[PDB]
Symmetry: C2
Subunit: 158 residues, 2 copies
């Protein structure tokens, strides 16, 4: 009913927390963790301290994380991997269940087209959230993987 959506990376992991009262979508809070520091241990440290922070603050029922179908540069991907993994585990160690969605599935879901440009997806995220957004470091991307989970979760088995 309360979903954390995390779009993690080398440099910064963004976050989107929202509730869903059956069909009444609702913005709770979003943001971007900034783990820029040179050192890995510590940058991995910050991902975790932050994520489990959000958890400990928003008290979320599910964990949404998107997946990788097109993850083309080898050494850029190792780093996504470590960022990925730490975020996942902080979630798991918090007892929250992790849900992996294909970016393919996140576009179809929000905007109705899986060939939609990122700003078309960001645009819909903020219409829907009625976000008086004057955007940033584009937290909407994490917000969007959040919406998705709902659609799917309230769509599966019948």
């Amino acid at each position: 009913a309360i979903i954390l959506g995390i779009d993690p990376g080398s440099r910064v992991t963004g976050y989107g927390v929202i509730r869903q009262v059956g069909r009444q979508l609702s913005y709770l809070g979003s943001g971007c963790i900034r783990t820029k520091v040179d050192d890995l241990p510590s940058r991995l440290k910050l991902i975790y301290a932050g994520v489990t922070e959000i958890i400990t603050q928003f008290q979320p029922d599910y964990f949404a994380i998107e997946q990788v179908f097109m993850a083309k540069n080898a050494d850029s991907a190792l780093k996504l991997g470590q960022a990925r993994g730490v975020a996942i585990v902080a979630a798991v160690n918090q007892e929250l269940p992790v849900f992996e969605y294909a970016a393919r599935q996140v576009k179809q879901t929000v905007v109705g087209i899986g060939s939609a440009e990122k700003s078309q997806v960001q645009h819909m995220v903020r219409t829907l959230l009625k976000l008086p957004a004057n955007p940033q470091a584009d937290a909407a991307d994490a917000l969007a993987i959040a919406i998705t989970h709902c659609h799917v979760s309230q769509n599966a088995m019948q």
Copy 2:
């Protein structure tokens, strides 16, 4: 006093603890945690536990991981990047100071040559830690990296 070298692998992870006392090198133990399990969320967490159960059971001072740079498979990069990010955090959170060694400082430290091959390396490890011993699998890859730390710890101050 106590060094732990780790070899994080999505499917398997070797460890090697050694004891450095003065200039006296001593073998405490080694093995491999078999994190073979389908659900990604659990592999990870198994890495996390396994690595932590060794940290408490053995109680290292230091943590030593070998850096990963070249690889050119980007589906596997992301597969090795998660695990290795989960193994590092496991130690961050137990209050272990973590150090990375390039695959070539390791060869230079135990084999004398840089472009050595592992048969050599692993061959020479059993010697260092005077141990003509019965390889389960072969965690010899973690003992070498832990051995490196003991060397590149014993090097410039004065």
